[model samples]
Target chain A: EYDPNLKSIDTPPAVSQQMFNKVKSNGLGQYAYAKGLSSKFIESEGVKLHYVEGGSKGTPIVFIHGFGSTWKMWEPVMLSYMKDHKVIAIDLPGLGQSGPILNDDYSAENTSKILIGAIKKIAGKGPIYYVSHSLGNTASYPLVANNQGYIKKAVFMDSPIPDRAMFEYPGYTADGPGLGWHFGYFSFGDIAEKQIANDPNLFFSYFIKTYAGKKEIFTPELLAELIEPYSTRDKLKAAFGYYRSHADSIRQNEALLANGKKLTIPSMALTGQKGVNDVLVKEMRARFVADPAQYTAIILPDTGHWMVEENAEGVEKSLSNFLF
Target chain B: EYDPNLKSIDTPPAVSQQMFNKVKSNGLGQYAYAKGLSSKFIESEGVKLHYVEGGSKGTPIVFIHGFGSTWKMWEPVMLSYMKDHKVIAIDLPGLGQSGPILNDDYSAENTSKILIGAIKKIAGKGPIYYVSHSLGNTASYPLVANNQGYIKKAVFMDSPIPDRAMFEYPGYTADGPGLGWHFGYFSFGDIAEKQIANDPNLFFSYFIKTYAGKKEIFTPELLAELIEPYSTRDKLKAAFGYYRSHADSIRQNEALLANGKKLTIPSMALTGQKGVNDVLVKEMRARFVADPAQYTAIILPDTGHWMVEENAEGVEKSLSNFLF
Candidate 1:
């Protein structure tokens, strides 16, 4: 199950400014630019949150990535998609450069609370065109629900709605909530991360490879980024805890919706072409309406869950079209 | 006469990420970087200062530039000399990225008080090497004297002990306190900055050019940066206030040294040769003891006040030698 070689296989070393210069002359283009502004670390108690910021000068576009990942995931299309719209991408609690979530509370509501505080720290008193990927979608819902300053728009990039009630009563069957739960991802993804954490050198790459659309793109450095953070038990527990709490995640948000938490902002439910995230797409649509003037539900052609990295051109074109 | 072309010529548009990438890939190297970390804003009750950060990991070497100057002045020598010592250069109160001081109070004690808080914010809790230049020299005196946590060593780069009272009465003569007072600099420098602020386009380069060691190095962008911050009346007043309050500055710090504001840590006093900063080098020698293991008094050959920029190799070599 867990392989020590996973950690030994290859992970890039942290690129300090000296090494960063050795690699690129001006920058990695927009990737470096957005990060230039966003790279400032925000601290609260002992938790250190990392973010990349840039774009225009006004209310910004905020990007949040799911668990076991860093905000860098959104870089592929963030530059072009931004078109000067000022964007801020943040590493959610317990992941990437943003260290552990304080209070040991990674539940949807609590995490959203910390996210809200970070958003304030960056954008000050403005609103945002909130963009999210995977579990980030789950987190964004409550964030906007509580802080409705402005959602000019929302993008649920390849996500799923979390209620256990959505699962089947009898047939552990086709199309059940547990459908497509396989190869160390999804339902047991949390437990998978924990096991991988205990023996990263043993299980990291073996696990992440199952979810990536193209394995060839895995550089030693990139793999290192993916595996490094989840190595510690504390981190493994934090990331896995999110998956383990799907039922509570559902209960908390459902209660908010019941009490008038709304997603009335212009919205989009985009996914990868090969049924990667459509199940959750439908659920989101049922929960919120799209402003046709500002919405689309399209899938990229010949792609998988890692659409942002796998289909940059198609992703940017469609995302730009939706936002413009 | 002031050069009006200095103010009339438009500098390049603000260099954004795309353009930065367009220029080169590696970065402008450390020039862009030291400023990179130094540029992030740090807030206090009224003032919000900025600083550049990077290099090494643990306790950092902090660079503070002279009054009327941005922390950018310290960039050149920082990278090579730091050799990964983690350096942070700051834009002092009411200047550079930090606008006017909150309450227009630029007295040494008050400004250094704010400086201490900002440095602590950047380094969190650990002490700093506290490297300084010009007024920065006087500024660092109190900062280290007051907060001696880990100031294992301190470097006064091209500085003078404040308070004209220390300048001369008897043999302090030939050069009492007002040695550098010139046509449009020193004693009347505050008025000069105020007048330039009144017509930044007409007088900025004129005043700065007068002091720079060599004119060939001043590029339009560089000139623009130098002029921009000191352009406003409020900024001019704040930067000048440092000169006006030297008497009060000496009173505060000398009082510290008189009692127990001991600069007990190892220290160094470095100056430009050809009599640039050597005048005050004597004061530093008298105020703090010299140890071959700890302190040194040296001067760069053929250099002036802008020694770091004009003779970086010498500055880096000697400064690092002293530091190590």
Candidate 2:
């Protein structure tokens, strides 16, 4: 029987409960301290979003995470730059500690609307600096292109853009199957459900292995930290929903760009030189708006996909220098 | 209960075959071409060894690989330096295209004897320049200490000198339970048998995944090329035999050092800044070798464990300048 609920059982109850408890007790506490340094929760456009704010007071910098990662991924960068400007990191709806969306209108347009509204409310009539990683960077495009006066500058880190042409080198083809293999799994919700049910251990193991550059990097302590937030069936489902819903958002972005709208804000595309996504940054800059005369791209050498974590100092320097 | 020949049904055949095909087909053809350019197979003291010769004819440079990797890993560097001095990369016995040991005497001392024999045959009584990575570097210790006349200068890249301190690292300690987890897996013959009985596909999949910095780096095509060599059961078993025999070699090296024999040859340790094994290079130079003045250490930035592959041009330049 193709029972969706049956897949949920694959996750061991003991492991799940242990993860939940760990997150609630230790993970949350760590998050609180980490967040407290730059944290802000706001309600805008009838939606509540959780964010961490840092940097100086004049320019408002908004940071976002990729799929499956929360705003905390920017902690190292945020800590370094928060005191200099109005740096902020937000958890998109249905992710991290943010309140869930009331409806299924989680398209990029809707998410952009919600993000713009939150930024407007938080920025308080100041020049806004937008920073995003992976999916977050793509999602912010609509907001950056549509909203004038709201976004003064934007920085996209390791984002997906139409730069497949650049990855045509000999060794570069290795990354194609690497990035392409996940599309089917992310496109289908059932896969995640089945993964959770049939073999939670394997599912989580695969999750960690797939995301991490090196398995040893995910130390036992770090694994415990990561497993904490998404231990429950509901939490895991919500996380998976982010990936499934992203397809709709991508479609919306395509439509918006097709209609002649383009990013008008001063923008910088930052990527780790060693990361697969670095191949796309040049093409992304070429697609920027005419009004934004200061379009730039920077690659942090020797970093992986998790640039903010891997090279926080470099990320912060790039962001602060570009914004200020 | 432990049937050595009974293959585990749980293992996936696709995984091993895919990896094998990846190594055989991809950049390997180019490497094979380079190997042919410098081809020299010589009979050396009870064994015949294959090696690629290049660089200045008089200044002979010998190269070796870590466990599982072949002499082909040095292809890029060798090609770059072919016009300069004589550069020779050998397929250590039981690896690459080299023949396995006929007798059970596969100890480091025995391997070193074969290496000495190969040097005698290939270099024809000239001073040899030595370059080795990981286990190859470790295996070269005896040659550097005893046959100093044969080896004029040496370069060690991320060599694992098994001292008491290395066992404490997270990568080594955490890999205790996994198959071929580390050098420790070779401790028990039964464990090796069980590992072989498991699906070859699953074994190769795990093997590739173990070394890849990012799962994306292991493209299906690349994986296929990597595993193409070990399609048959005999090949896989023989490969494991090398690892199994390596335990005795490690112990023998420890005893040799304890007995006051020390490396007197001029050597340089070049390592990737991010590589874990590089950590021990400095300590090993100071503690293990008799002539500290003959040792020079350097860490290459923006590189990982596969420093030679990642920074081939730079490595070649460094070697050319250093050796000549």
Candidate 3:
């Protein structure tokens, strides 16, 4: 059901009305519009899913935010390109404004089905550009690799590919407890459930802060807007389940790549100079693909995991130059 | 006179233990080394200025940070050119780990004196390449324009110009209140004093966040380290006062240019696509200099006010390709 209460999961309480008033007086009101432009909740497939969309009309570009982030991350790039072409930014089922998936089918194949359905609904009958960040890239791989006809181009923004060698590399440490534990937690259903039940805010906030590289960027206003979609306990659990279900998808993707399958469509990987995930693009290109020529890689200098928000101009230039 | 407490004004507490550890782990523990290496602090004229130096021997390159930032912002470009050139990154007085200018004389003229002194003390007989960002660019104008033989090549990263038309432009609003207010606050010394006394953290944080676009880029750890030098109440006031004093320099430069003084040195203004400050670069070249041909302007595709930090690779490439 489309419930308003379901939208307030991790939202912080309003603290200072005076400060809020001042912020609103000083152009804070536009922020609400901006947030709305990048976030949406749509009921599809007998389920309420959160999504974000932007840009104007030409060929539609659909972006999926990485793990721990909503579609807000893509606002910078989306705002830049939206003037000309249609840009649709989406939050995968469990994250962002998208409510949790009812079923346990969070695998790439299943997620791709839901994604394609949503893309078809949003994009109508136009050529589509599929862009994904982090895990969102993984979930969309099945759609782009298998159904290239629907997606004209694909851009993987710092998508993670399993690199065993990175584990032993210098400065590389095994994904352990604390913030690192989410990597392992998401891999297990029981652990993810327990962690969510115990404390959803801590777990989610930890991931957001660690990945964001700083807490200040996650302003109180941003937190309120982002967490609103998953305010309830059930929604929180569902969000965590979204992560847990991805384990199957990861393994399946590994096997699929190891076999004879290859990314047949034109593809590009965008990354930042700094951040752990930057190396993932390189590894994916070298190992997973059959035809290396089909893929192109770009690393924006001095950026972190959230490249779209941080370097929107760069993303727009790179995408426009590559796509148009 | 080299009191650690006074030096503390130049070095704010570490923003985060993690960031401090990262700098240390990366072998950037010292304050000053050769003219171009890693993180180094040099005591000059009773002020312990922190800087980073790299590149080879011969002509020296001095890179300055914009407002509310430090030398690390130039790491990407400096590290790249350090192989064959002497690259120097300085924490402008009252910024980074540099001691505060106890005297209220932080005008562009005074800053030029400090920077020129630092260059002379560090470079000895080597030719110089001067790179400045925002306020740093303003300070460098006196050095490059008035003091001949100090700089061979000059690059301004989004240099601000004093033209009413420049400020009235549309995109100029993107500089936001934190930056825009500086124009007003700096013009009136009263607001500057009040800002420093009321809440230095909020004031500094606002500037850093406004300039950075994404606060995540300046992690708390990084901010802490960067802010250490500007912690004291008086130092922060002086820093703001420097901006106040800029009005005179801008007026002086205008008159000088009207009298047919153009920056004859190889000058390039590198700006980010979304940066409003770059709007003035063309005008500065057209009106302020004798030989406009000697001036070049390049806008980085995906960047903001903080060009060095946001698009280090692009900046590095542009510098090496243009200068070398």
Candidate 4:
């Protein structure tokens, strides 16, 4: 029942076996099995997307991970709600085990469309709870706002659609503090690919340490597992591709906002205190959401950008409070 | 001495005759002649850019207009500075008589590069004061910050690099308030070009009236004159191309900021009270400039977006105070 090979058979060959092996060799496959999660794949817009689905029938809880991460990023906390809810964690196109998007356009507009198609097939027409983290929200924000008819509630776990503030964030660099160096760095695809070739550990280790509040959680094994998918040059390109389209994604979000599209769904912004913090919460309520009554903001203490892993208990508790 | 034909001969045939005829037919050529200004073109990156230059002495002042406008937008207030300072007003690529940018990329990064190439040729290794308005500032902000070695001072009038606040500003649409509708409208190139074909007059009239604090300044003739250059469908594409690249431009500015680039040059943010006002000034100082001591903020009373035409006297007085 927990066989990853079943899902691998369904997935496009090039992306399937390698990811399964990586997860099996690492603890992720076992981890998912214990949580009653079984890997699955669905064709959306001619591309195969990998996901893990489990639990008895109830309101489906859809989880989407951020940049350079797969569905496994949500695996740790996903089991908490599995007993009463059908939990699904998606691997965004070009990341995890998902096949590359046709034309490889990782722009939020394209990804969101493809994602919505997959969601329609997997979740069906009914109420669902949507949870998203980091760059995943670029796709989620638009999807949730546009398709609020079925999404009863939403959870934004750090990272609003890439806005000017995020882009303007000072790049903590060896030279000195500058505007988002990583954004600039990743924006140039080939340059980042070449840089990643130098030593991806430097890249992953640096970002992880920087983004994490609970440093102890990132053991060498965990870090190695985290670095595994992206170790391949193609995977590196896929992850970097998301940043490459940030300008496009940002504009897409801007267009939605300009068109007077607001997140009208009853929503909760669960941000890490040490992460985006109050500023993001302020922006969400003031600029994005239509009614304050429909919005809720929660800050999990002693956590950085990765709230799910850093403070799994807080994330579980918050989701329990908000979803119920 | 101010004969339009002198410069007309030097300009590329197609752009020269049409723009000259339009300006000569209207009052712009006469207006420039009276101010001792003469139209000129210089090849920058193989693209011909139109500019008007005058004045015998003092630091050269460069004036760049906002979207849908040419160097003529600066004509009214430009004369004031011409009396005591060397003044030059540039028609950005794709707008006015300037030929389309190579590859038709109106992205700020590309336009700014071309603009700087032209500025280098015109100003030539001198202490100059940079003045820019609206979308022009998107190019100006990066140009000035990166090239402060030769630029003695800078003036940001109204727009200050396309930031989140500007993008987030409610779009004043017929459907009521939304995010920047014009940005959304113009981002879609073909759609905006088609929309402009509906009635370029409606587009110009609405924007000119809305941007003007002194509404009486935009007479029927003035509005028609303003509408002339963009009457051609190709010109519409060129103009829309700038807005299409706004997302790209905004990210370019973000990259600069994240890279820790600051505008170290002594800068003056001269804004229309009814326009960007205090908020832009706050962001300029708090986020952009390296030192508060070197920054000056001035709000021209009762002026709107088009400070040059709406409050020429105030613009003149502010320039006098700041440039000196």
* Candidate number of the best TM-score: 4
lDDT of 2 by residue, B1-324 (tens): 011122212334565555555556564631465543666677777576777777655577778876546677787887776776566788787666677776645566778888888777776677878888876865676776677766787777865554433332221111111111244333223233233333444444444443433334555455444445454545455555544455455566667788877677777778766454456576667666678887777777766566665677667767776787
Tell me the docking grade of candidate 3.
incorrect
Clashes of each: 35, 33, 36, 10
Candidate 2 vs candidate 4: which has greater TM-score?
Answer: 4
Q: What is the DockQ of each candidate?
A: 0.00, 0.01, 0.01, 0.02
The full ranking of all candidates by DockQ, starting with the best, is 4, 2, 3, 1
lDDT of 4 by residue, B146-253 (tens): 888789888888765665444444322122212243554454325446445435555565556655567777765666577767766677888877766666677777
Per-residue accuracy of model 4 over A110-217 as CA lDDT, tens digit each: 888888889877887868899998878866667877888788998887766665455444332111222244554454324345445334544565556556777678
Q: After superposition, how far is residue A170 of candidate 4 from its true place, in Å?
A: 4.2
lDDT for A63 (candidate 2): 79
In order of TM-score, best first, we have 4, 2, 3, 1
Give the range where candidate 3 chain A is weakest over 10 consecutive residues by summed lDDT. A170-179
Please give each candidate's TM-score: 0.42, 0.46, 0.43, 0.49
Which candidate leads in lDDT? 4
In order, the candidates keep a fraction of the true contacts of 0.00, 0.00, 0.00, 0.00
lDDT of 1 at B258: 75
Q: In candidate 4, which residue ranges exceed 4 Å CA deviation?
A: A1-32, A164-167, A170-179, B1-324
Candidate 4 has an lDDT of 0.70
Candidate 4 CAPRI assessment class: incorrect
What overall lDDT goes with each candidate model? 0.59, 0.59, 0.60, 0.70
Candidate 3 RMSD computed on C-alpha atoms after optimal superposition onto the true structure? 18.9
Candidate 2's TM-score reads 0.46
